[PDB]
Structure 1
Amino acid sequence: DTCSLASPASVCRTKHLHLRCSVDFTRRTLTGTAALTVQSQEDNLRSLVLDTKDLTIEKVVINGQEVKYALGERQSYKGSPMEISLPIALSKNQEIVIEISFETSPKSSALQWLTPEQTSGKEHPYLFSQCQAIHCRAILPCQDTPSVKLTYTAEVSVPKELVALMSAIRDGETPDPEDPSRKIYKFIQKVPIPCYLIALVVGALESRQIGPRTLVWSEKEQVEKSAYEFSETESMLKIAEDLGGPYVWGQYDLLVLPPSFPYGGMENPCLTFVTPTLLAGDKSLSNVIAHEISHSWTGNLVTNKTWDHFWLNEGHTVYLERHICGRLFGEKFRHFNALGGWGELQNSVKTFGETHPFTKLVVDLTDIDPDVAYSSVPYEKGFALLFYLEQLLGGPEIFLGFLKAYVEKFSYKSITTDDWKDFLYSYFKDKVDVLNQVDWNAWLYSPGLPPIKPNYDMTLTNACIALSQRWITAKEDDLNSFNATDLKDLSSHQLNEFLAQTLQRAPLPLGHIKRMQEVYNFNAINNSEIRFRWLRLCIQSKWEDAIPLALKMATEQGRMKFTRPLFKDLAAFDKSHDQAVRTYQEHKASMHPVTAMLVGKDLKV
């Protein structure tokens, strides 16, 4: 694991974390102890190395006594390695508890601390974590690699008027014995997990039940809207269970976060985190819930061994997500989303350049901050491979037998791309000859678009392409013929694909874009996917009226998918360039630390 500084799993393995901590909003720190139950994997183990990032270590205690440890020099985004001297050499398989008293930094890359005014209520502050990929080390010292799986319990002291939740089953609350203004919330995760899956939120939260095993959590003002948007959750879970096997995590809860949450979703076990930008009014961005749910098998049960193999998490999840959406809405809809996905892949490979190392399916993250390498490639190129293999091996029903068996095979383990491919060869051993016509070295290791494009039903996509081509081939004297009735028989999804198609050939003349707004009133659409593509199109086609609208969306929410390219587009447009950097600098302090960093690089500030 080249993104980690800790002792690898071949040396020692954490089996358990007991986390006792207190959330202090006055200092914006979390303080407490992390007791790691560690098992030696080798004879005569005398030292052990842990990942940390911007942590302040008070002490380290084993068998009731303080021991020697030292902090290495910082290695940029990887943080600083912590070497602990064991008081007694350990034999193979021996286990000890190591108790580390620590404090986080207010600058922790895993954390965003929000003032009361940054929340919906305006009365209380809020805190959330985001550990994927390598941010867990910025909360607590650990072996910060997905190659190692541990269970955990935690006890979290917070101001009594707030709620704490984690990626675990709730196990009771009580007043803090050491401070009656505080509550302690207790948590147990009985299923071994990689530590990137550890999560915490503290805020003024309420819950409403929406299925036999799902509560929605968010601030008071978002609850009602959230319970409607996500009401299909149980029925998606049921489908995912038929596809991948039993849901083993107990509860499937949903937290709807303040708008600066950086991602569409994070598949935290027992408690998926989502962006409030999913709240369209009409359930249309639900693909994202199906994605999150699907991770309960692909990534949370079978996990990538290192981040070079992330495509295993994401490809299989997008594969299952799309099947779910195909069961609910039909096979032609699965093909629509898949083809859209391919178009997202063209964009990413155009953006990076077709020989860019990050357009490889398997990458080498040696000396690369995973947050800099992150994009749609592992999602859409990985999904593209699996879709290709599906058509090649005899269809969806057959490839789903493999996906289910693949989940049973590698449950509770961490794997590499070769583990995946060896299993693929074993399961289809009667089709080894078909398997060998695949160009493995290209699909897995070459940059750029994959070397073969699957087949796609075009039924639902045609009308989108048709209308997009009308706009692009149109001259001045054709603009009159565009009319609101053009949108008549398009779902929001087809409207989104319409724009996506059009965005790919941007810029268009300004007169076209003005006419589009004249007749389709896209300025009124609140659907965040559609609005995003629309503002992008307007900004790249140089419409100055779009400037305030795009600055507002870029900053009112902070989903990296939207905020990063809106800022880029704004910076590349001479008229908005200066407000773009200006707005970034005035918002920078109150941004998610990871979003802030990446936007800052994107703008060269």
Structure 2
Amino acid sequence: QSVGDSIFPSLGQRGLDVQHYDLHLTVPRPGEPHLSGDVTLTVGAREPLSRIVLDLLGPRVSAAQWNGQRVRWVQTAQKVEVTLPRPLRPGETGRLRLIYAGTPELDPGLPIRPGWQNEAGLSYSLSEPHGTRGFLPCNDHPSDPATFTVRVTVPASASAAASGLFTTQTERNGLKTLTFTQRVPVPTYALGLIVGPLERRTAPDVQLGTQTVHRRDIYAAGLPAGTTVPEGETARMLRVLSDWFGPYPDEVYGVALLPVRQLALETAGLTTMPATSNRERVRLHALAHQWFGDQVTLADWADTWLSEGFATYAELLWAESQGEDGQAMAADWYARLSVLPSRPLRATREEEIFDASAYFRGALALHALRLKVGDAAFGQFLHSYVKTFTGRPVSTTALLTLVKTQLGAEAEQTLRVWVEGRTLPPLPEP
């Protein structure tokens, strides 16, 4: 009944297609985990669903409605299960509204404890792979991206930032409510959401051939001296990356710089950026994920290399665009891998999905493919890959099939050497 993920086999509901989350989240004390929520999911289905089953971990549901009517529901250890008056069938949509409140809950196999983070007067989502269920009843699996509208209610002395265009801020009874609209669909973990002492700072629009990309970064209080985004760097990165991948998927881009010590997460249009991770290559990496991870989403967590490896390889494309020697950079990555265990790129265990192979063997896989077919065909292929897997989750098998179709059998064989096999292949060289 779950999505059947090979790494996280309990998450999600098979066949559920959440199309939109309309979330009103109230955070009474930023930096403390308690919260209350009011969410309406607009849901479709790929198969008839007699129940809607959502992931939820911590908060307690107090009320539920289906299309504005009372509905039967039960909350278990990690799910909310709603019985519909009749099955939701493919092509239809319905509105599931859930009222909930409590404490989001945050596994040695992962680099972080994902979910609703609380520290230093800030509460924020750092929820890859499966933490969003802590503060939002959701289909918590990247095969089911969705658009989001988020209203965050916080004390008037605080502020908030969520993924999407910021439209309105209202204040009453000492409470401030800010509204954000994420209009291109992304996975649940790509929903950025930060509350606390933060401020928005805009930059000039970035004009790309096909689109305009708005610019704003979020700065939290307490940042280390020298925490910045170099002026004009983001526009050049957008230009270089979009020339390689195709149009930037979203309407805005920036980073939310936080004074915490943590990994950077490619939350949609607004990367969640602990100051300790704020380096050029990480900023490029997180922006590349806006394509590889946020627009092109994973069908299964075993295939994280399709996100982490592509985003990593984007750093090398960026370096070359700035005049650096890409082969030396690939050689540096290879030297690092040569003294570490290697594995086939499809992960078999949770401990692997963010390991060195997902990043650097994944990137070197693309390096091998690029060297086999030349830069023109490689760029054309990346454009085709993004379009092919827009609106459709990707898998390693589907990648190889597309390479075979678009680039030919020898290209596919080159990639397969890197995708398959326990030992590390030789360094890809011209």
> Do they superpose with TM above 0.5?
yes
Q: Which residue of 1 aligns with 2:267?
A: 268
C-alpha deviation, 1:379, in angstroms: 0.8
> Does residue 402 of the first structure (1) align with residue 381 of the second (2)?
yes
The match for 2:283 among 285, 289, 300 is 289
Q: Which residue of 2 aligns with 1:327?
A: 321
Match of 2:64, SS state, is: strand
Q: Which amino acid aligns with 1:149?
A: P
C-alpha deviation, 1:228, in angstroms: 5.1
Q: Which residue of 1 aligns with 2:242?
A: 241
Does the C-alpha gap of structure 1 residues 150 and 437 become closer, same or farther in structure 2, counting only changes over 3 Å? closer
C-alpha deviation, 1:86, in angstroms: 0.8
Structure 2, gaps ≥5 residues long: 107-113, 206-213
Match of 2:404, SS state, is: helix
Match of 1:225, SS state, is: coil
Q: Which amino acid aligns with 1:241?
A: S
Contact 1:29 1:105 in 2 (8 A): yes
Alpha-carbon distance between aligned partners in 1 of 2:115 and 2:412, rounded to the nearest angstrom: 43
C-alpha deviation, 1:435, in angstroms: 3.4
Count residues with an aligned counterpart: 409
Report 1:395-434 matches (<5 A): 395-429=374-408, 432=409, 434=410
Pair member with larger Rg: 1
Does the C-alpha gap of structure 1 residues 346 and 413 become closer, same or farther in structure 2, counting only changes over 3 Å? same
> Does residue 314 of the first structure (1) align with residue 308 of the second (2)?
yes
C-alpha deviation, 1:344, in angstroms: 3.1
> Does residue 298 of the first structure (1) align with residue 298 of the second (2)?
no
Contact 1:206 1:223 in 2 (8 A): no
Match of 2:297, SS state, is: strand
Q: Which residue of 1 aligns with 2:111?
A: none
C-alpha deviation, 1:450, in angstroms: 2.1
C-alpha deviation, 1:444, in angstroms: 2.6
Task: Report sequence identity in percent.
Answer: 24
Q: Which amino acid aligns with 2:321?
A: R
Contact 2:34 2:101 in 1 (8 A): yes
Alpha-carbon distance between aligned partners in 1 of 2:366 and 2:231, rounded to the nearest angstrom: 28
Report 1:117-128 matches (<5 A): 118=120, 125-128=121-124
Runs of 4+ in 1 over 6 A off after TM superposition: none
Q: Which residue of 2 aligns with 1:15?
A: 19
Alpha-carbon distance between aligned partners in 1 of 2:281 and 2:177, rounded to the nearest angstrom: 35
Larger relative helix fraction: 1
Alpha-carbon distance between aligned partners in 2 of 1:259 and 1:221, rounded to the nearest angstrom: 9
Q: Which residue of 1 aligns with 2:208?
A: none
Does the C-alpha gap of structure 1 residues 8 and 25 become closer, same or farther in structure 2, counting only changes over 3 Å? same
Q: Which amino acid aligns with 2:376?
A: E
C-alpha deviation, 1:14, in angstroms: 0.7
Does the C-alpha gap of structure 1 residues 377 and 437 become closer, same or farther in structure 2, counting only changes over 3 Å? closer
TM-score w.r.t. length of structure 1: 0.63
Does the C-alpha gap of structure 1 residues 250 and 223 become closer, same or farther in structure 2, counting only changes over 3 Å? farther
Q: Which amino acid aligns with 1:415?
A: V
More contact order relative to length (CA 8 Å, sep ≥ 6): 2
Q: Which amino acid aligns with 2:34?
A: T
Q: Which amino acid aligns with 2:297?
A: T
C-alpha deviation, 1:62, in angstroms: 1.6
TM-score w.r.t. length of structure 2: 0.88
Alpha-carbon distance between aligned partners in 2 of 1:224 and 1:377, rounded to the nearest angstrom: 34
Does the C-alpha gap of structure 1 residues 30 and 344 become closer, same or farther in structure 2, counting only changes over 3 Å? farther
Report 1:52-451 matches (<5 A): 52-73=56-77, 80-105=78-103, 107-108=105-106, 109-114=114-119, 118=120, 125-176=121-172, 180-212=173-205, 213-220=214-221, 222=223, 225-227=226-228, 229=230, 231-260=232-261, 262-263=262-263, 265-278=264-277, 285-330=279-324, 332=325, 334-349=326-341, 359-365=343-349, 368=350, 373-393=353-373, 395-429=374-408, 432=409, 434-435=410-411, 437-438=413-414, 440=416, 443-447=418-422, 449-451=423-425
> Does residue 5 of the first structure (1) align with residue 13 of the second (2)?
no
Which string of whole-angstrom CA distances, capped at 9 and with x for unpartnered residues, describes residues 86-123 of structure 1? 12333332211111111242544412212xxx3xxxxx
Alpha-carbon distance between aligned partners in 1 of 2:89 and 2:201, rounded to the nearest angstrom: 50
Structure 1, gaps ≥5 residues long: 74-79, 119-124, 280-284, 457-605
C-alpha deviation, 1:438, in angstroms: 3.6
Which string of whole-angstrom CA distances, capped at 9 and with x for unpartnered residues, describes residues 234-278 of structure 1? 111111121111123111121111223x21x21111111223124
Alpha-carbon distance between aligned partners in 2 of 1:83 and 1:41, rounded to the nearest angstrom: 18
